[PDB]
Scaffold this active site. Structure first.
Site, PDB file in Angstrom:
ATOM      1  N   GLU A 117       0.847  -1.107   0.005  1.00  6.49           N
ATOM      2  CA  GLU A 117       0.130  -0.031  -0.054  1.00  6.49           C
ATOM      3  C   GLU A 117       0.900   1.167   0.037  1.00  6.49           C
ATOM      4  O   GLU A 117       1.718   1.290   0.844  1.00  6.49           O
ATOM      5  CB  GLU A 117      -0.973   0.000   1.069  1.00  6.49           C
ATOM      6  N   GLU A 200      -8.948  10.236   6.028  1.00  7.06           N
ATOM      7  CA  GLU A 200      -9.105   9.368   7.110  1.00  7.06           C
ATOM      8  C   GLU A 200      -9.255  10.047   8.408  1.00  7.06           C
ATOM      9  O   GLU A 200      -8.423  10.782   9.184  1.00  7.06           O
ATOM     10  CB  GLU A 200      -7.841   8.454   7.343  1.00  7.06           C
TER      11      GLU A 200
END
Length: 219
Positions: A117, A200
């Protein structure tokens, strides 16, 4: 388009998708809505509004825009140009603003995780930190980034701007090239399978991320 308040509410025009994606809902209490403000093949504008409390170090959601792509090996990708303009009205929070990309050796891996990622945090608010530990500092594309690394079955590199970048134009291959040439990233056997941009939240609110333009392409 219209209104995305359900947990996995989503809207798409083909090339761009907007997702509410409250995957971490259980880690606390609060609520979040996402909106498509405009969308075409030239980019997408959207915003998301949230309030969250509890689970001080778990992520509550990743509302995001996402770009469709042909899955290619990272070594064979020529450019991933992207531009974004965004703002937060309330920065007295614990959250990040970040790109999120996944690669895997299996071309049909699920696109919400992978072997690797890559995160590119354009902003870090308050007492939050990326996965793992900070292993370096590097200048890429004209910005200085903290480089963070960690993770077990999914390995996550996070490039973090210590000062918020609300107007960004870049090429994500700059970041893949750096990891390939200096950190042994196996570009030649990893397929890029997803690219998103969003926020986030950990705690705070209410706050609204307003993305007035996001563009991306995987070439």
């Amino acid at each position: 388009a219209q209104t995305l308040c359900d947990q996995y509410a989503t809207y798409s025009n083909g090339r761009y998708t907007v997702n509410n994606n409250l995957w971490g809902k259980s880690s606390g209490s609060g609520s979040q809505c996402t909106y498509v403000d405009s969308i075409s093949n030239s980019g997408v504008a959207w915003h998301t509004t949230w309030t969250w409390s509890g689970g001080d170090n778990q992520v509550k959601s990743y509302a995001n825009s996402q770009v469709s792509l042909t899955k290619k090996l990272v070594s064979q990708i020529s450019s991933i140009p992207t531009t974004v303009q965004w703002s937060y009205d309330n920065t007295n929070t614990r959250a990040d603003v970040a790109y999120d990309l996944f690669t895997a050796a299996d071309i049909n891996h699920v696109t919400y995780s992978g072997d690797y990622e890559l995160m590119i945090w354009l902003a870090r608010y308050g007492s939050v930190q990326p996965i793992g530990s900070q292993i370096d500092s590097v200048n890429i594309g004209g910005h200085t980034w903290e480089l963070w690394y960690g993770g077990s079955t999914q390995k996550t590199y996070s490039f973090v701007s210590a000062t918020p970048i609300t107007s960004f134009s870049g090429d994500v291959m700059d970041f893949w090239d750096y990891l390939t040439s200096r950190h042994g990233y196996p570009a030649s056997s990893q397929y890029l399978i997803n690219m998103q941009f969003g926020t986030e939240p950990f705690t705070g609110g209410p706050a609204t991320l307003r993305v007035s333009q996001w563009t991306a392409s995987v070439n």
